[PDB]
Amino acid sequence: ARECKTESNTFPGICITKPPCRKACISEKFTDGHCSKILRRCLCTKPC
Amino acid sequence: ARECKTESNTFPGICITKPPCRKACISEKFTDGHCSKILRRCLCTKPC
Amino acid sequence: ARECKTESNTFPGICITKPPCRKACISEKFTDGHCSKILRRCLCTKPC
Amino acid sequence: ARECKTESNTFPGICITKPPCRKACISEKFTDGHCSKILRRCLCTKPC
Amino acid sequence: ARECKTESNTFPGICITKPPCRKACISEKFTDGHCSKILRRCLCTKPC
Amino acid sequence: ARECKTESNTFPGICITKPPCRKACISEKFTDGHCSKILRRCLCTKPC
Amino acid sequence: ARECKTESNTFPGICITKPPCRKACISEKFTDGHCSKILRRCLCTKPC
Amino acid sequence: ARECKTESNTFPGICITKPPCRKACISEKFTDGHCSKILRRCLCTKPC
Amino acid sequence: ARECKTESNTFPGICITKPPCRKACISEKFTDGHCSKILRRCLCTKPC
Amino acid sequence: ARECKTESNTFPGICITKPPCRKACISEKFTDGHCSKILRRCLCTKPC
Amino acid sequence: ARECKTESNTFPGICITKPPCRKACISEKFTDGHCSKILRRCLCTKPC
Amino acid sequence: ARECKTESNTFPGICITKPPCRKACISEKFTDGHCSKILRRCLCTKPC
Amino acid sequence: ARECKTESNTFPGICITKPPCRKACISEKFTDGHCSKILRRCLCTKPC
Amino acid sequence: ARECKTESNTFPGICITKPPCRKACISEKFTDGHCSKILRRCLCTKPC
Amino acid sequence: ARECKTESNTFPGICITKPPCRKACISEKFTDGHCSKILRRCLCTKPC
Amino acid sequence: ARECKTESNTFPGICITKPPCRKACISEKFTDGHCSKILRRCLCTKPC
Amino acid sequence: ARECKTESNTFPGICITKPPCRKACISEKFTDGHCSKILRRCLCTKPC
Amino acid sequence: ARECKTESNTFPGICITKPPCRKACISEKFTDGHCSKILRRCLCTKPC
Amino acid sequence: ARECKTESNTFPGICITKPPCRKACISEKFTDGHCSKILRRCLCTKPC
Amino acid sequence: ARECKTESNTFPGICITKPPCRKACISEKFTDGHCSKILRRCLCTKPC
Ligand SMILES: CCCCCCCC(=O)OC[C@H](COP(=O)([O-])O)OC(=O)CCCCCCC
Ligand SMILES: CCCCCCCC(=O)OC[C@H](COP(=O)([O-])O)OC(=O)CCCCCCC
Ligand SMILES: CCCCCCCC(=O)OC[C@H](COP(=O)([O-])O)OC(=O)CCCCCCC
Ligand SMILES: CCCCCCCC(=O)OC[C@H](COP(=O)([O-])O)OC(=O)CCCCCCC
Ligand SMILES: CCCCCCCC(=O)OC[C@H](COP(=O)([O-])O)OC(=O)CCCCCCC
Ligand SMILES: CCCCCCCC(=O)OC[C@H](COP(=O)([O-])O)OC(=O)CCCCCCC
Ligand SMILES: CCCCCCCC(=O)OC[C@H](COP(=O)([O-])O)OC(=O)CCCCCCC
Ligand SMILES: CCCCCCCC(=O)OC[C@H](COP(=O)([O-])O)OC(=O)CCCCCCC
Ligand SMILES: CCCCCCCC(=O)OC[C@H](COP(=O)([O-])O)OC(=O)CCCCCCC
Ligand SMILES: CCCCCCCC(=O)OC[C@H](COP(=O)([O-])O)OC(=O)CCCCCCC
Ligand SMILES: CCCCCCCC(=O)OC[C@H](COP(=O)([O-])O)OC(=O)CCCCCCC
Ligand SMILES: CCCCCCCC(=O)OC[C@H](COP(=O)([O-])O)OC(=O)CCCCCCC
Ligand SMILES: CCCCCCCC(=O)OC[C@H](COP(=O)([O-])O)OC(=O)CCCCCCC
Ligand SMILES: CCCCCCCC(=O)OC[C@H](COP(=O)([O-])O)OC(=O)CCCCCCC
After folding, report:
1. Residue partners of N38: CB distance under 8 A and separation at least 6
2. CA end-to-end span of chain C, whole Å?
3. Hey, which residues 23-42 in chain O have their CB within 8 Å of chain A?
4. Is chain B in touch with chain F: ≥3 Cβ pairs within 8 A?
5. Which of G10, L10, R18, T33 is least buried, going by the fewest C-beta atoms within 10 A?
6. Which has the closest alpha carbon to E35: B13, K48, D5, J48?
7. Where are the domains of chain O?
8. How far apart are the first and last CA of chain O?
């Protein structure tokens, strides 16, 4: 029931809102995505 | 008695006013929603 | 799945290492526990 | 390589050197482990 | 013919983009919806 | 019920007093008319 | 006296001037309302 | 269903963890308490 | 030699960079797209 | 029936009332014309 | 100008400000209390 | 193709309507001209 | 002499410093590039 | 009296506050416990 | 295997997202690249 | 038994071994003394 | 009575707490393990 | 000749002086080793 | 199989070799004695 | 296979040369002896 995390490699530009990062991360065969707090990076998550 | 919390997967845009976040969170099968103070993100809530 | 988060009420002192906060969260009928990055608060996580 | 990350559940104490974190992460069925640069936390990794 | 407008009753929060305001007005049995320039309210429009 | 609003397409000049604007709006098949507060435009109102 | 506060759940748009927010808050069975300083939210107030 | 909110009158110092603020708020005849995110104030909550 | 404008009805989220808004506007059978200045709305353009 | 918009290029002066802008826009082979809210520019509209 | 010092055994949480520690220390039948500078421990004091 | 922009060299005064700014830009051997949304600067455009 | 400017259509990520934006713009057949102040966009420039 | 010390073999994690180390040390049939200054080791003491 | 590290020679500016650093590092005959946490340097990696 | 602590008033010089510090503390109406770890200060102890 | 020591071949990383060093040394068919005071290495001891 | 770096995985304890770390690195098929400045980690180096 | 530790109260001077400190600790009703590493104090040990 | 080490209990005086310490160590049922580099203590070694 762990949540593994890695940075998106297909997300363009600044990560401001969640649905775009979640959509790109799901496209990368992950389950969810969210933005980082400081550098606005789109992080992909999936169970592991 | 204890409120659990997670970020909304469907809420678009910046979380400014509460009602739009509560509506998106209730649609996601939660009991309420609210914005984060700093990053302005829609956080869904439900009893743990 | 979705991960829900809430602050623990039994963890004493500052949260430095994860196992102690994880232990108190499992004691609080949760799945995992981790420390916050700035104020070092013990946060309990579990499926929503 | 692209690596998924999650914090070690079993690693005790401050993460200073890599081998102790790697040892706990491998025991948790992960490929490797490393210390976070700032907060000094043992993060487990596996290919993604 | 002429276009009559009135404030929406189901649109929550601040009117930023048009599709959300336009969708609520159609559910309110109007033909179109647009955001007010200043106060950012959802104005529903239909033929008079 | 709700009040639908549209500008007058027959009122000439500045909208200073109410009776002339109401009189023009009733001729335009509306129930009432009033002046806008800043630009002094004659506005016609009727039930939606 | 001690005043309790909550954000309005009926106020549409951004909060520029006080009277529109005060009106919505009073319809919500509060005694007054005012605009937040930065994000221009409508905050309702009433004695606790 | 409305959560009224006001700052605690008995909580001393800065609000870091929830239990100390919730404890002081219940002693003030409120149902819960939490820390403000930025100013770290202790805010008491009860149904309006 | 004039350009017709309308807001996108398929663009997701906030318009920061141009290429994403141009791509969504082309899918809506326009020729180009650009962001609004403040509210960051994706505006579609095409020859009138 | 999406509405495409462009600024008038024959309207002289400042757009206060709608009839002058609508008449100028129809002479420009558009279906309607309305004033902008702040700068009072005449804006022509027609189906996209 | 001497004070006998011992660590508090009732102070919960992090010791950032003086008031919370001094409050818990007086309840422990001491006269004052202050926080340690690094680990943020509550230290009670009383005249020797 | 791609459109490059630069502020006009000859346009006198504040840029409110488009036709005046378009004339000055064409006189400067550019294609079109438009106003900036904030400082109201006349911006000339031509293919990059 | 006169500097013509457009936004890059190839620059990936946040524009914090100049050299990364300058390198992308030269590949785009421009001569220089700089970052926007607020949203940190890469803007390419070249002589008109 | 004469006081002897030995490192605790049951205290988990980092020794921050005294009560956890004291409780673990008394569990080991000792009389008191405190933390070392630098490495934060839980040291158990008892009459020797 | 183990990963050797060295700072990229061709990476301009600071390292924000991974794909830019990975691309420059691969062109320098390395297998991967990532950003340093604090100084935001592009560090090229290859098996060792 | 709870132990109170303060630095000696009369201990001459740098605290290295225990007996000299204990002697000065017993003279100062305390029960025992010991050296601090870093600055090597003689610290007197007695029950609170 | 007499005791001989040697460096541990199994203990990884820095030697902070005694139990992990004793556990590795017992696994190396020694009777006890402890950390060297300075270089913080795990030393294995057994009857000599 | 560009040099590559990897943290040692056999060096015991903290890294105070170079020779002990350099010796462990050569046994790891590297050419040299040195201590990190703050956390005193043994870092192995060899030509890339 | 657990050694308790206390500083000698009879050994004079600095502790260089083991036999002298060991002898002084035997007279103090202890099993063994050894020097501290840096300050060269005589430490007496006996089973807990 | 492994060299176990302990301090000699028969060597008198300073340890300047190896042969004198080796002779005393061999007399103590050991294989070899050597001087410590700073304190000049005679240390006996033998297979573990
Ligand atoms: C200096 C006092 C304040 C504490 C600094 C803490 C640094 C920190 O939080 O690093 C993480 C942050 C990147 O965040 P993100 O990539 O997860 O969005 O950091 C960065 O992006 C790195 C740059 C940090 C600022 C420059 C170095 C001092
Ligand atoms: C002008 C300074 C005024 C005082 C600032 C101090 C406020 C404060 O305590 O912030 C801590 C907050 C929550 O911390 P934690 O519970 O996650 O450890 O964590 C954060 O604020 C970080 C999360 C937000 C990330 C975006 C920061 C730009
Ligand atoms: C020929 C000169 C034209 C400009 C001078 C008058 C400005 C103006 O048009 O204000 C009125 C207009 C809407 O008013 P109305 O059409 O409802 O009467 O728009 C507004 O109410 C704009 C409000 C401006 C303040 C915004 C910040 C709170
Ligand atoms: C000590 C006096 C107060 C200053 C420190 C407290 C920070 C603070 O009040 O943040 C401002 C703002 C709050 O919005 P509002 O709901 O109060 O209108 O919310 C935000 O900041 C939202 C995030 C974006 C940052 C501001 C952008 C303009
Ligand atoms: C006095 C200096 C002001 C400088 C900025 C001027 C305001 C401005 O240009 O607002 C643009 C925005 C329209 O959104 P957009 O679709 O054009 O991005 O319009 C609005 O958001 C209208 C409501 C603005 C309310 C502001 C309240 C503080
Ligand atoms: C250097 C600072 C300059 C600030 C004033 C900017 C003036 C300006 O361009 O306002 C016009 C803009 C849109 O007007 P319009 O083309 O719809 O008539 O209006 C809007 O976008 C709506 C908001 C206007 C009022 C803003 C009050 C904060
Ligand atoms: C590898 C293990 C890392 C452990 C990290 C935590 C150590 C630490 O914070 O020690 C604090 C201690 C006293 O702190 P306090 O309780 O007075 O706030 O220290 C001092 O007051 C002395 C200052 C530091 C002197 C020694 C430097 C290592
Ligand atoms: C190639 C660089 C382009 C600008 C980079 C980002 C900063 C910015 O937006 O400044 C300009 C902007 C005016 O917008 P516009 O009317 O020029 O489109 O903002 C203002 O008008 C505010 C600043 C100027 C007035 C300051 C008054 C204290
Ligand atoms: C604290 C936040 C201030 C900016 C609010 C709007 C946020 C936003 O998306 O601004 C983008 C826009 C263009 O800036 P840039 O992305 O080109 O650097 O920026 C502007 O046009 C800003 C103009 C501000 C003029 C103010 C004059 C009083
Ligand atoms: C480069 C500086 C080297 C300092 C260490 C050498 C001296 C040493 O180890 O002294 C023993 C001390 C034990 O402290 P404690 O057991 O009383 O908490 O342990 C420490 O003080 C260990 C601190 C080492 C921490 C280094 C960063 C991880
Ligand atoms: C920075 C200016 C010089 C140091 C001033 C003293 C700072 C201070 O109050 O440190 C006290 C603290 C605890 O020492 P002790 O009472 O446990 O021996 O920890 C220490 O004494 C650790 C610091 C030792 C190293 C001093 C600077 C080289
Ligand atoms: C003056 C102390 C704070 C600044 C230390 C120097 C800044 C720095 O390089 O931080 C990163 C550094 C990495 O250690 P190393 O692997 O390079 O030895 O080490 C750390 O991140 C460890 C932080 C040390 C303080 C820990 C809390 C007491
Ligand atoms: C930066 C990390 C390391 C800082 C010092 C850590 C504490 C430390 O090593 O204390 C023990 C040592 C003497 O101990 P001992 O010989 O009495 O057992 O030393 C002292 O008593 C400390 C006195 C200060 C001078 C130490 C010189 C090596
Ligand atoms: C205030 C007292 C300062 C130290 C004075 C005493 C030094 C001392 O006794 O050094 C020898 C001893 C180990 O010696 P030996 O048993 O290997 O011959 O211990 C050491 O080698 C410890 C070296 C000191 C720390 C060096 C920096 C980490």
Report:
1. P37
2. 8
3. none
4. no
5. L10
6. B13
7. 1-48
8. 6
